[PDB]
């Protein structure tokens, strides 16, 4: 599945965590409230962040402060609230790593309570 995809919240409802593991991008899970949910091997590999470990904090206050904005967290709480989170940008990641250049691409899961971050290099 491609970054991007227009239908990739329907291809990645159908996958473990080996597979989504397996991905070209970074794809992180969230709750409405910014918890994490899902973290992949991919988006370790930009961040340097275990994936094992950063399961349960929360995104925005803890795990990626630079996101805390109305360009990111803004996004990401109007899409919460709307109910049709679907959004791309890009952004630079850069606490507690090298600074990073990324596209983002926020989407709502099927299922109950999750939303996406997608993330790829630039
Ligand atoms: C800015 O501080 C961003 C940091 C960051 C973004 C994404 C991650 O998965 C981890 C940290």
Same mark, same amino acid.
Request: proline share 3%; aromatic share 12%.
């Given at each position: 599945?491609?970054?991007?995809?227009?239908?990739?919240?329907?291809?990645?409802?159908?996958?473990?965590?080996?597979?989504?593991?397996?991905?070209?991008?970074?794809?992180?899970?969230l709750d409405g409230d910014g918890n994490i949910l899902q973290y992949n091997?991919?988006?370790?590999?930009?961040?340097?962040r275990d994936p094992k470990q950063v399961i349960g904090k929360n995104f925005? #206050?803890?795990?990626?402060?630079?996101?805390? *904005?109305?360009?990111? !967290?803004?996004? $990401?709480?109007?899409? +919460?609230?709307?109910?049709?989170?679907?959004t791309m940008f890009e952004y630079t990641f850069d606490y507690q790593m090298?600074?990073?250049?990324? #596209?983002?691409?926020?989407?709502?899961?099927? *299922?109950?309570?999750? !939303?996406?971050? $997608?993330?790829?290099? +630039?």
């Amino acid at each position: 599945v491609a970054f991007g995809s227009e239908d990739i919240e329907n291809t990645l409802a159908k996958m473990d965590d080996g597979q989504l593991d397996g991905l070209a991008f970074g794809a992180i899970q969230l709750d409405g409230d910014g918890n994490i949910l899902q973290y992949n091997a991919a988006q370790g590999d930009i961040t340097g962040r275990d994936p094992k470990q950063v399961i349960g904090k929360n995104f925005f #206050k803890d795990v990626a402060p630079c996101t805390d *904005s109305p360009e990111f !967290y803004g996004k $990401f709480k109007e899409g +919460v609230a709307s109910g049709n989170l679907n959004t791309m940008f890009e952004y630079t990641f850069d606490y507690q790593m090298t600074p990073t250049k990324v #596209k983002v691409h926020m989407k709502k899961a099927l *299922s109950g309570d999750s !939303y996406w971050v $997608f993330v790829k290099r +630039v």
